[PDB]
């Protein structure tokens, strides 16, 4: 059977599910998914039932998405409720800290200020801000209300115990837990800031726009960013305390059945969703509110498969709730992320010489390591600019750049004997790329190509090629040399992968190789001893100019495709200042004074350079680079980038 066992937490919910089950039987053919209805006492009990393989799916608020993820449950987000509109689905809200313009303080100066909360126990108004501020609170932090009352000088915290902690109700005497209190709820907390009672209101990003219709009034307000800067109120996506998903269907991380859950729910919304007007309605029910799904929901979005719960909830949210759950409070060592056994070994002996200031964690791919930097399992790694773009879109920032000598040169290599080849038309030729998504092998050359053909189907433009990372059936995998499952892989087990791998591809099979200005000189004239390169001379290879002319290999200064952004080390914003300092000290000791090749850092690198204002992927890579990659992701297959685009489109 293809049965999805839905888990209900009430008798009203069990009745709706049973109607859900019966109406779907009349719309789904017998080969399709069917509903079973399991009834438990609580959301916690449904989470355990799903982990125990007694049910398959339940819909949770963000806090319970966190609980469902913790061992031994290990549930995973799989389907999202969206709200608003099909054109602009709203899946998340943003908990923000609004302040009045020019009040003169930052997020790390909240102690002693006057605070306005929507209500004790609520997400944006209490659990997230107090979760983030937890270790800032005075000891003993238990009971929490007493610690908060001795952190803010006065507050309006609706539903707090004002009898025992009267500071919490200075701005709303009694801490009235209903609309009879003018500072209660989401507008109440913002009104507590507007009327001048408090200095800061902890609310949702939309409260400001629903209580202040005209932008002129809104310009008198700002938001507190976690980097201790302020931003305007409509920049909440770059300046919030946490991004919170409203209502998430969860499932077992292994054993699913994600596939079945989505095709059940997606069919259900197409026949019984909003505006479908049948006798059964998925997002309503005659008896009781919000049964199985929120009554305000407008449909379902499939959660991208790369995403786990920590990535879905976000780093900020997870920190806040873990602080409240665990209550644990201490620059600490920088945990580098390695991609190989050989790369891990280099880090290991680096860690032991750094006397603890460096630690090592491992992952199988670059994307896995990036996800570990995002969620805190890892801290830093050095990335090609193409991965810096991905790391940036996923919330990470560049901190230092590898300097090889303004960065390296992306050039197009051809064989000198091929007199006909020109940059103006290489259509129908055989291409060799370092990998899809990398700076010199893909983003620079194919970005320029996109401008003169205006599409991303480069396997239909070149006859064939080796572009490691392309889909195994593609014209651009046919020239690759990996065997078995390694054919066309963007790793070492594919011999045409990388700067020199793409040059070898040109030497043996291809017509053009997109690499960097030093690749040909380092792999010719006997410098590379491998049989494929040993007997090559660099005078038999030329560079393709943008002109349409050609020049010798070491004339790259005036025959390049573009200047490339250097590889850079990326990190979280909260670890930027510290990663900057530890790495500056460690290269003073182990710098200019790899067992295999280019492990952790490229071997051309001389120093790790500071970046000044170019501390953002948009400012580090440049407007031209980012616009070109935006053009190319119309054909990108990056699962990590898909997960990060789902949270920040
Ligand atoms: Fe590169
Ligand atoms: Os009833």
Swiss-Prot record:
In-chain residues carrying the UniProt-annotated modification Dimethylated arginine: 21
Residue sites binding hydrogencarbonate 2 per the record: 434, 438, 440-441
Protein keywords: Disease variant, Disulfide bond, Glycoprotein, Ion transport, Iron, Iron transport, Metal-binding, Methylation, Phosphoprotein, Repeat, Secreted, Signal, Transport
Outcome recorded upon mutating residue 256 to S: In allele TF*C3; associated with a reduction in total iron binding capacity; risk factor for iron deficiency anemia in menstruating white women
GO-annotated molecular function: enzyme binding; ferric iron binding; ferrous iron binding; iron chaperone activity; transferrin receptor binding; transmembrane transporter binding
Protein name: Serotransferrin
Cysteine-cysteine disulfides: 7-46, 17-37, 116-192, 135-329, 156-172, 159-177, 169-175, 225-239, 331-578, 337-369, 347-360, 394-644, 432-505, 456-635, 466-480, 477-488, 545-559
Residues at which Fe(3+) 1 binds: 61, 93, 186, 247
Organism in which the protein naturally occurs: Homo sapiens
Gene3D superfamilies for this protein: Periplasmic binding protein-like II
Tissue: Expressed by the liver and secreted in plasma.
Pfam family membership, one: Transferrin
Chain's gene name: TF
